[PDB]
Each structure stands twice: as C-alpha cells, then as structure tokens.
C-alpha cells in the first residue's frame, strides 16, 4: 500500500527535530538515527548501516546529506521504482521548491554515503584487529 500525506508530514517533523535551523542538511553520523526515527514504512530500523549504504545518498562536503535526496531515496525504498514514482518525484521536487524559496541548500555533490561508510567501517575493522594483535603480544610474555 502507497504513502499517505501523513507519512510525509511525519518525515518533515522528525526532519525538523534533526534539522532545527532548517539548513536542509544533515550530518553523516546522524543519518542512521534519522532513519531510526521514522514511522513505518519510511522507517529503516537499526541496525541499518548496510541498508542505508545501498540507497543513492549523495553527500556534499563536508559529509552533509540534503533533505530531498533522503526523501527520494527513502520513498523509493518503499514504492519502489515505477511510473507512479516518477510522478511522485515531480510532486516532491515541486512541493520542496514551494515550501523552500531560497538557494542556500544548493551545493554540489562531492561523494556518496557508501564511500564515507566504507572508509569508516574499514577503519573500525583496522583498529579492532590492531588492538587484537596488541592483546596477543601482551599475553605472549607468560
């Protein structure tokens, strides 16, 4: 079943809770929380990093993600791709171009969520294996 107007409203609600100043962006690390903070079906519940890394989420430097990119991606997760989706994109881009008059959030894409995430979780694995080797070496002396 499709998406009610209620759903969009709740989206913009928690969006405000993560974006008080209406910069229309959100930080890389806060994304996961945002995905967790939605009602179904938009909701991507934790753990969700591998799920989030699978959607097209361009980031502008420095590691910020735009609202509309998240809206498109998150609604596409649900629908997903179709002709009705294209029309819905027309509507979303229009409604956004309405409720937002300025050009302050218009900044060019520099990477994608997936790249940053690949770096971060690579690091996580590295530091982990390093602590492991150190532990093994301290244990080595008995």
Partner 1 sequence: EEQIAEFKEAFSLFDKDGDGTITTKELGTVMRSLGQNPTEAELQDMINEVDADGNGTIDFPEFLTMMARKMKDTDSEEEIREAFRVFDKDGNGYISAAELRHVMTNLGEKLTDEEVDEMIREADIDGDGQVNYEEFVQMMTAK
Partner 2 sequence: PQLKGIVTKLYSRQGYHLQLQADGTIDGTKDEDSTYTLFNLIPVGLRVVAIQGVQTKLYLAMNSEGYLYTSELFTPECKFKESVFENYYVTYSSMIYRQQQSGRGWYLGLNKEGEIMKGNHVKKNKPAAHFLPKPLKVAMYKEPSLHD
Q: Which residues bind partner 2 (CB under 8 A)?
A: 53-58, 61, 66, 68-69, 86, 93, 96-97, 103-104, 106-115
Which residue, 53, 58, 63, 73, is CA-closest to 122?
A: 53
Q: According to the binding rule CB under 8 A, does residue 137 interact with partner 1?
A: yes
Instruction: Please give the Cα distance from 72 to 88 (Å, whole number).
Output: 9
How many residues bind to partner 1 according to rule CB under 8 A?
Answer: 29
The one among 79, 87, 90, 124 contacting partner 1 by CB under 8 A: 124
- Of 12-20, 47-55, 57-65, 70-78, the window that binds partner 1 (rule: CB under 8 A) is 47-55
- Angle, CA 87 vertex, CA 81 and CA 91 arms, to 5°: 120
Choose the contact partner of 128 out of partner 2, partner 1, none; CB within 5 to 8 A by kind: partner 1
Q: According to the binding rule CB under 8 A, does residue 56 interact with partner 1?
A: no
Instruction: Please give the Cα distance from 94 to 91 (Å, whole number).
Output: 5
Which residue, 14, 30, 13, 23, is CA-closest to 107?
A: 23
Nearest approach, Cβ of residue 142 and partner 1 (Å): 6
DSSP conformation class of 6: H
Which residue, 12, 95, 25, is CA-closest to 66?
A: 25
Choose the contact partner of 123 out of partner 1, partner 2, none; CB within 5 to 8 A by kind: partner 1
Please give the residue ranges that form the binding site for partner 1 (CB under 8 A): 47, 49-50, 53, 117-135, 137-142
């Amino acid at each position: 079943e499709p998406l009610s107007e209620d759903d969009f409203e709740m989206f913009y609600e928690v969006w405000e809770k993560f974006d008080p100043d209406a910069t229309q962006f959100i930080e890389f690390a806060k994304l996961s929380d945002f995905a967790d903070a939605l009602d179904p079906p938009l909701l991507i519940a934790k753990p969700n990093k591998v799920q989030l890394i699978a959607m097209d989420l361009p980031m502008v430097s420095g590691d910020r993600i735009h609202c509309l990119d998240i809206l498109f991606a998150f609604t596409k997760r649900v629908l997903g791709e179709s002709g009705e989706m294209d029309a819905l994109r027309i509507q979303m881009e229009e409604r956004f171009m309405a409720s937002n008059p300025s050009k302050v959030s218009y900044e060019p894409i520099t990477t994608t969520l997936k790249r940053k995430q690949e770096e971060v979780s690579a690091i996580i694995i590295q530091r982990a294996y390093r602590r492991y080797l150190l532990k093994q070496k301290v244990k080595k002396v008995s």
